[PDB]
């Protein structure tokens, strides 16, 4: 199962690691992407977790979009896990690069109360904008089912953990 996770929470938990190698580790029921609403893994942990699959992220997300359209920020889609988990949980949070309103933020981490247990990142961090301080406060605020957090950046995780209220 998890390990090396501070625990922040009653269900919220916390580690510096990087998305990819903790998703091949544990391979969880469900892993979180940081999507946008194409489903085009660029980059970001999106892009991160689409390389890691060879690109089969990609192909089947170009499908669903075909499909079905693209998704609302603040909302999601369950795709498969591939490789890295059973089901990817693709998230939308907003992305205030985009200037996108960031209240949709609580809306995307309710997707996560659908699924006991998760692997995320922090949504609407990084390339998406936001503080991530403010997107670990919405996630603590929000998510009720067990979370385990993966923060790429050292410096930025011991920023979380030292200011954590
Ligand atoms: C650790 C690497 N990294 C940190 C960030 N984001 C921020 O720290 C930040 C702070 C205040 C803001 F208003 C917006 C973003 C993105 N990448």
Same mark, same amino acid.
């Given at each position: 199962?998890?390990? !090396?996770? *501070? &625990? =922040?929470?009653?269900?919220?938990?916390?580690?510096?690691?990087?998305?990819?190698?903790?998703?091949?580790? +544990?391979?969880?029921?469900?892993?979180?992407?940081?999507?946008?609403?194409?489903?085009?893994? $660029? $980059?970001? +942990?999106? $892009?991160?977790?689409?390389?890691?699959?060879?690109?089969?992220?990609?192909?089947?997300?170009?499908?669903?979009?075909?499909?079905?359209?693209?998704? &609302?920020?603040? !909302?999601?889609?369950? =795709?498969? !896990?591939?490789? *890295?988990? &059973?089901?990817? =949980? %693709?998230?939308? !949070?907003?992305?205030?690069?985009?200037?996108?309103?960031?209240? @949709? @933020?609580?809306?995307?981490?309710?997707?996560?109360?659908? %699924?006991?247990? *998760?692997?995320?990142?922090?949504?609407?961090?990084?390339?998406? $904008?936001?503080?991530?301080? %403010?997107? @670990? #406060?919405?996630?603590?605020?929000?998510? #009720?089912?067990?979370?385990?957090?993966?923060?790429?950046?050292?410096?930025?995780?011991? &920023?979380?953990?030292?200011?954590? @209220?």
């Amino acid at each position: 199962s998890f390990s !090396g996770y *501070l &625990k =922040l929470t009653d269900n919220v938990y916390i580690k510096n690691a990087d998305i990819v190698e903790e998703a091949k580790k +544990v391979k969880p029921t469900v892993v979180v992407n940081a999507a946008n609403v194409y489903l085009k893994h $660029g $980059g970001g +942990v999106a $892009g991160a977790l689409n390389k890691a699959t060879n690109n089969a992220m990609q192909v089947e997300s170009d499908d669903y979009i075909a499909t079905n359209g693209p998704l &609302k920020v603040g !909302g999601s889609c369950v =795709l498969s !896990g591939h490789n *890295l988990a &059973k089901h990817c =949980l %693709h998230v939308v !949070g907003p992305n205030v690069n985009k200037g996108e309103d960031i209240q @949709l @933020l609580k809306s995307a981490y309710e997707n996560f109360n659908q %699924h006991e247990v *998760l692997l995320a990142p922090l949504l609407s961090a990084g390339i998406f $904008g936001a503080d991530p301080i %403010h997107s @670990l #406060r919405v996630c603590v605020d929000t998510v #009720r089912t067990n979370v385990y957090l993966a923060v790429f950046d050292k410096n930025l995780y011991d &920023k979380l953990v030292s200011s954590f @209220l």
